Design a binder for this molecule. Structure first.
Ligand SMILES: *Cc1cccc2[nH]c(C(*)=O)c(C)c12
Lengths: 12, 143
């Protein structure tokens, strides 16, 4: 996912 | 989109730059729902929104550290409830997330230390605890 860097993301 | 100045970004996150990572996520997932919603709603998000949120993450961290550092296992009633808080507020700020959905987010949480270093800046050895606490939480909350 989302932002690479604060808390959400990408991969399930 | 995100309305923040290079100098202001730091006031709210402190070193985390979305623009630079914006391009990066585009190449990584460049088509995931969780991401599309961020762009979707964030376009409406102002500074007041992110700060109230960051303060939210902080608070969430404060309890994790007080409970985690206490040597309390991540599947602790104390830890499991933390995750509950983690899911509620996070879904409403970026995208409706399910147990299965971000529990996995929790495991890939460690893969890109860009997340861990910004989060762990508050406590060395927490990104991993969040992962076990969050992943475990999804186990019992997923019927
Ligand atoms: C803070 C923020 C800015 C841009 C994009 C984002 N996605 C997420 C996922 O958690 C967050 C919180 C942000």
């Amino acid at each position: 996912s989302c932002t690479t860097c604060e808390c959400c993301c990408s991969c399930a | 989109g995100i309305n923040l100045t290079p100098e202001e970004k730091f006031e709210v996150f402190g070193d985390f730059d979305p623009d630079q990572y914006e391009e990066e996520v585009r190449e990584r997932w460049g088509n995931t729902d969780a991401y599309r919603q961020s762009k979707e709603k964030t376009a409406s998000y102002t500074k007041e929104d992110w700060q109230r949120i960051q303060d939210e993450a902080d608070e969430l961290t404060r309890r994790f550290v007080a409970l985690m550092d206490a040597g309390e296992p991540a599947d602790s009633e104390g830890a499991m409830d933390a995750a509950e808080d983690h899911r509620q507020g996070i879904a409403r700020n970026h995208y409706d997330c399910g147990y299965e959905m971000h529990t996995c987010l929790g495991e890939m949480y460690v893969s890109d230390e860009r997340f861990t270093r910004n989060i762990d800046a508050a406590k060395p050895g927490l990104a991993a605890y969040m992962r076990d606490a969050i992943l475990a939480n999804a186990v019992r909350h997923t019927p």
